[PDB]
RNA sequence: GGAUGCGAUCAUACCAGCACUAAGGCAUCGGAUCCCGUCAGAACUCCGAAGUUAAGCGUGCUUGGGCGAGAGUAGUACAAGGAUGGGUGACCUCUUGGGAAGUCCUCGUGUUGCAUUCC
């Protein structure tokens, strides 16, 4: 998986003023742990008033998909920066893991809106029952009798050893 | 709980308006020979001790002004380093660091040395 979910826990440095400071937790999506802790300290500085130099890092744990063999419907609420302004949007995805949905979200924002990873803030992630899905192209795959042909086959050899520059006849492909 | 003399800090001590104070000390106060002094014994100077706490000085009060400390403003504004970062540009993102100031709100309104002295 490209993206991992982590639970990061930290607090302000214990000082004689408090000596038992409040504990803060976040669920962040990053490619490894070092990038997860940096993004945590980014949000703690901007949302609370605790930055890394005044704070303590307590724990960091990776969250995993409970059932990576079923298909879930995944809603994502995000904040992104465009060329002119800030906007929030809701996106829906179908995947066996929420990791795949987050990778799907980042890829889609890059294509449809030319938005890079730094300019995106995941507000909220959740699993949505198929009865409550909102976006089209997610409901149409809720058909229990779903049937269709494969309209693009990608004719190719299997293991690159069987590749030849020339062939004696044109390929026959059908669907 | 007070004062006086000489101070330290130099508004938490200043300013404005009100109220009150035992003893003592300060002070107001009486006078113009002498020293001194002016248009003027008002001031300054000299000599006193009839009266008074009215003023001054001291203490307290005010949803007071100011001053001082907090909280908040706000991880905002700004700004050190990095990017073959975005954008036509103006500018703006992210990354490794630093980080303010009015309004608004809360609280406070001194501390203290040496000598002598009053309860
Ligand atoms: Mg006279
Ligand atoms: Mg009086
Ligand atoms: Mg005041």
């Amino acid at each position: 998986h490209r993206f991992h979910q982590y639970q990061v826990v930290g607090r302000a440095l214990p000082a004689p003023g408090d000596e038992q400071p409040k504990i803060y937790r976040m669920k962040l999506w990053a490619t490894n742990e070092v990038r997860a802790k940096s993004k945590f300290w980014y949000f703690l500085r901007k949302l609370k008033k605790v930055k890394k130099a005044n704070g303590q890092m307590l724990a960091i744990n990776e969250i995993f998909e409970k059932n990576p063999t079923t298909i879930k419907n995944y809603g994502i609420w995000l904040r992104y920066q465009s060329r002119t302004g800030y906007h929030n949007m809701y996106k829906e995805y179908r995947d066996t893991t929420l990791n795949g949905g987050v990778e799907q979200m980042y890829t889609e924002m890059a294509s449809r809106h030319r938005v890079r990873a730094p300019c995106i803030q995941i507000i909220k992630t959740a699993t949505v029952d198929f009865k409550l899905c909102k976006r089209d192209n997610t409901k149409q795959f809720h058909n229990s009798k779903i049937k269709f042909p494969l309209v693009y086959q990608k004719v190719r050899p299997p293991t690159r050893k069987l590749k030849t520059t020339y062939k004696a006849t044109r390929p026959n492909l059908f669907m």
Side-chain angles (χ1 to χ4, degrees), chain A residues 1-65 67-158 160-175:
Chain A
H1 279 140
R2 213 222 139 169
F3 286 93
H4 308 94
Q5 199 178 21
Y6 301 93
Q7 195 225 18
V8 193
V9 171
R11 51 156 187 191
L13 260 166
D18 204 291
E19 193 267 332
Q20 300 295 140
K22 254 156 58 86
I23 321 280
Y24 292 121
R25 85 176 269 276
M26 274 191 96
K27 291 159 70 202
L28 303 135
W29 286 93
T31 34
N32 64 61
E33 283 209 347
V34 187
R35 317 203 168 108
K37 296 161 115 211
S38 162
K39 194 40 101 192
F40 170 92
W41 284 126
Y42 168 88
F43 281 116
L44 227 55
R45 179 187 88 243
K46 278 197 162 166
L47 293 174
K48 309 288 150 192
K49 253 211 175 142
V50 180
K51 56 164 105 150
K52 192 182 165 198
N54 297 317
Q56 210 172 33
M57 162 76 49
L58 304 176
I60 165 136
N61 298 95
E62 163 149 17
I63 309 175
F64 286 107
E65 192 67 49
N67 303 77
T69 68
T70 54
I71 308 171
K72 275 73 63 164
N73 302 302
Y74 286 115
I76 299 162
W77 295 253
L78 65 100
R79 251 200 41 173
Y80 78 102
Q81 190 208 35
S82 69
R83 276 163 216 176
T84 44
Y86 287 88
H87 334 259
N88 46 61
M89 66 178 22
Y90 169 71
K91 281 295 171 91
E92 253 194 44
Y93 298 92
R94 286 180 47 86
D95 214 297
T96 51
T97 50
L98 181 54
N99 300 46
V102 168
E103 203 199 5
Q104 270 178 268
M105 185 273 317
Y106 272 120
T107 328
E108 181 170 344
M109 305 294 311
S111 142
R112 293 191 202 277
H113 315 273
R114 264 71 174 183
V115 183
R116 281 83 173 170
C119 297
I120 289 162
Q121 265 155 40
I122 301 187
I123 302 168
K124 166 190 204 220
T125 36
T127 287
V128 201
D129 197 283
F130 67 91
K131 265 161 186 73
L132 265 52
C133 280
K134 297 195 278 177
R135 300 285 186 253
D136 221 350
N137 198 49
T138 302
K139 320 173 179 233
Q140 65 169 351
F141 284 106
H142 291 153
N143 189 10
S144 77
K145 270 94 40 177
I146 174 182
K147 198 182 71 118
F148 56 87
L150 286 186
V151 313
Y152 182 29
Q153 303 250 303
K154 190 83 172 83
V155 183
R156 54 170 158 196
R160 182 56 217 277
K161 293 183 192 75
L162 303 168
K163 192 172 157 68
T164 59
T165 298
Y166 310 93
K167 294 293 205 241
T169 198
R170 284 143 205 287
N172 33 230
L173 51 147
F174 45 100
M175 59 141 195

